[PDB]
Design a protein around this ligand. Structure first.
Ligand SMILES: [Zn+2]
Ligand SMILES: [Zn+2]
Ligand SMILES: [Zn+2]
Ligand SMILES: [Zn+2]
Ligand SMILES: [Zn+2]
Length: 375
């Protein structure tokens, strides 16, 4: 297994010139989890069957050649368990590769766990036991060690042959259309960008607040997300989630009160004045500018009965179509459908359970079931 380190624009351009003739490439990335808002990318790996490249983002300035490869419809891009990879791709390229297929998703439609690990999959198809000794290392350290490079290279080297095997297995089972739609769905979700004004909607206990308190949370979460993106710090390193909620709930009027609420010395010295000003702003906001209270799905009449009924339906669909119930519907997706049914919150698209491949399988049954619960 021979790999090439690519750290210059010219080398990247040369690589892509050769790769463009191939029908598919295996991709992967390595990044570290720190306190930054955007993950710190340490490496991108690519393999077309002949060229195995380890691309060092620190040495690249012009990504154009690779972005061209990544959007080329004649080159199928493959990865395994790529949720985080999608995040990194959007941050460095501004767009996701297409067409892009995830072997973990293909395997799930073939009967494997939605969380089937790369090493396990490689063991199954190649009989090779991967070395995980370099999995949790510092991908930003330089130069990377030979062992690190080998680990990174193996993630695409062994993936390519498996992509061909799984594409055949998935097609042979009749689930390829569904698997590709599912891959598209994950990609669409990752592309969604949260506007600062909507940051509050993702705080899971925001529903417990009254109108004035919620107006405060909206302003606070908007400010925090913008600050996080400005400083490149995860939102909780700006102001802890619990602390931000407390400011919204208790509507403090002094720095002394922020201390009483538990905010740290750093949060107070850097953001105290701002937080208090946001509270005051919400306090003086005109009622016609206040947000509507949230409707806790769990407190809607019939919720528990409907949830149980849907779970039961999913089980029947699962046994009939010989597909995992977890793949058919997660708790998140069931709640998404019920939030839609009862119009408990704004949703951009139709619920996943009654759209795309899932809808084709059970939308009729789900709509029939929902007739038992008043909108
Ligand atoms: Zn060239
Ligand atoms: Zn080359
Ligand atoms: Zn990955
Ligand atoms: Zn990897
Ligand atoms: Zn500011």
């Amino acid at each position: 297994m021979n790999y090439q380190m690519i750290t210059t624009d010219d080398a990247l351009a040369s690589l892509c010139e050769a790769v463009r003739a191939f029908p598919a490439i295996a991709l992967d990335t390595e990044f570290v989890r720190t306190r930054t808002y955007y993950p710190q990318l340490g490496l991108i790996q690519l393999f077309d069957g002949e060229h195995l490249a380890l691309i060092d983002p620190l040495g690249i300035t012009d990504w154009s050649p690779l972005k061209a490869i990544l959007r080329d419809p004649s080159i199928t891009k493959f990865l395994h368990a790529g949720s985080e990879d999608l995040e990194v791709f959007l941050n460095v390229f501004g767009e996701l590769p297409q067409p892009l297929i995830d072997t973990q998703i293909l395997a799930a439609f073939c009967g494997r766990p939605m969380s089937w690990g790369f090493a396990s999959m490689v063991e199954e198809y190649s009989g090779v036991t991967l070395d995980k000794s370099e999995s949790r290392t510092d991908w930003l350290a330089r130069p990377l060690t030979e062992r690190q490079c080998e680990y990174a290279a193996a993630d695409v080297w062994y993936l390519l042959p498996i992509t061909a095997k799984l594409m055949v297995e998935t097609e042979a089972s009749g689930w390829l259309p569904a698997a590709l739609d599912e891959c598209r769905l994950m990609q669409m979700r990752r592309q969604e960008v949260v506007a600062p004004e909507d940051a509050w909607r993702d705080i899971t206990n925001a529903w417990q607040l009254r109108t004035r308190q919620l107006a405060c949370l909206q302003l606070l979460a908007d400010w925090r997300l913008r600050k996080a993106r400005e400083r490149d710090l995860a939102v909780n390193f700006v102001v802890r989630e619990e602390h931000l909620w407390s400011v919204a709930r208790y509507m403090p009027g002094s720095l002394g009160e922020l201390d009483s609420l538990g905010l740290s010395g750093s949060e107070i010295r850097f953001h105290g004045k701002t937080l208090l000003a946001l509270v005051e702003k919400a306090q003086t906001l005109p009622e016609d500018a206040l947000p509507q209270p949230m409707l806790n799905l769990m407190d809607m009449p019939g919720y528990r009965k409907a949830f149980k009924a849907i779970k039961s339906l999913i089980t029947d669909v699962s046994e009939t179509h010989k597909i995992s119930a977890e793949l058919l519907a997660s708790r998140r997706q069931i709640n998404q459908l019920l939030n839609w049914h009862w119009k408990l919150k704004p949703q951009n698209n139709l619920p996943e359970l009654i759209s795309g491949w899932r809808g084709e399988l059970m939308a009729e049954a789900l709509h029939n079931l929902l007739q038992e619960y008043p909108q």
